[PDB]
Design a protein around this ligand. Structure first.
Ligand code: HEM
Ligand SMILES: CN1C=C(N)C=CC1
Length: 289
């Protein structure tokens, strides 16, 4: 199964920087969401979930087709809460009806990471909306109650190695868990992209507790929480080395996250050799906006 990137007719960098800017300005405006976290974190999670359906074995799923717009995927229990991100993006799509759905969802995540002071994440256009019958079944996104071996195996389906997994997981510095979405809860409120996920793993005094949904999670006094799968990154010796590396090198973390996140958002897509180079968007701050 081959998905060839096809640039939205006539469009160029500048068109996409205007979409980026509309997303970024809305992120600034709609500040009250989720007790003033704002929409950044949910948009990152949306971009990941629309991509994380991909299966390297047959090229099913993935960001290309924009299939989250269809009820089977929209209603996946693994996607509970992402409707908030979709509804944030609806007026953006209204304004720029020419962008594909996969382009919009993925660009939302890039815009969120950057506006949250994260690394620059190069982004390529040309995902093309595919029909309802191409929507992947539920059950392709990962469970949170499992161990390191589960995480490692899971991510092989997405063609991600240990470093890529540990880097991607650093997004769990952002936002929070909500009991009614996932059966996990914490006092998370962070909307600045940093390496503090790794610092927190190493430096906090973690307690394995049961939450109000009767699920186990790791809690600290300071208010942080880690899923079992997060904590597994310090229970496995190979993951632990990489957690230490990122806890000790913010720039390396940024660089590795950028590469892994772009890769995640591009898995399954064939870029023609005369496709445009990846775009690196300016932040609102860089533009004086
Ligand atoms: C083993 C892999 C992973 C598991 C089991 C997992 C699980 C979860 C769970 C259960 C939540 C809480 C959802 C809710 O209650 O609203 C969550 C939130 C989140 N996840 Fe993951 N996740 C994983 C990987 C990732 C990756 C790879 C990224 C992106 C690079 C990501 C980004 C996020 C973000 C940004 C949030 C916060 C959402 C918000 O604040 O609304 N996750 N994750
Ligand atoms: C703040 N967050 C904490 C986690 N353990 C997972 C997602 C987000």
């Amino acid at each position: 199964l081959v998905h060839v990137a096809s640039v939205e007719k006539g469009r160029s960098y500048e068109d996409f920087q205007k979409v980026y800017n509309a997303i970024a300005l809305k992120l600034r405006e709609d500040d009250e969401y989720d007790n003033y976290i704002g929409y950044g974190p949910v948009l990152v999670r949306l971009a990941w979930h629309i991509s994380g359906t991909w299966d390297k074995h047959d090229n099913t799923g993935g960001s290309y087709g924009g299939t989250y717009r269809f009820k089977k995927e929209f209603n996946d229990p693994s996607n509970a809460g992402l409707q908030n991100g979709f509804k944030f993006l609806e007026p953006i799509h209204k304004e720029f009806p020419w962008i594909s759905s996969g382009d919009l969802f993925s660009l939302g995540g890039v815009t969120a990471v950057q506006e949250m002071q994260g690394p620059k994440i190069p982004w390529r256009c040309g995902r093309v909306d595919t029909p309802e019958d191409t929507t992947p079944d539920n059950g392709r996104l990962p469970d949170a109650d499992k161990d390191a071996g589960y995480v490692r195996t899971f991510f092989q389906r997405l063609n991600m190695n240990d470093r890529e997994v540990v880097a991607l997981m650093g997004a769990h510095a952002l936002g929070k868990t909500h009991l009614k979405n996932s059966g996990y809860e914490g006092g998370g409120a962070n909307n600045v992209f940093t390496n503090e996920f790794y610092l927190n793993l190493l430096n906090e005094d973690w307690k394995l507790e049961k939450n109000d949904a009767n699920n186990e999670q790791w809690d600290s006094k300071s208010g942080y929480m880690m899923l079992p799968t997060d904590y597994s990154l310090i229970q496995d010796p190979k993951y632990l080395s990489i957690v230490k590396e990122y806890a000790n090198d913010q720039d390396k973390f940024f660089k590795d996250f950028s590469k892994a996140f772009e890769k995640l958002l591009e898995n399954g897509i064939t870029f023609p050799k005369d496709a445009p180079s990846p775009f690196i968007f300016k932040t609102l701050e860089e533009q004086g906006l």
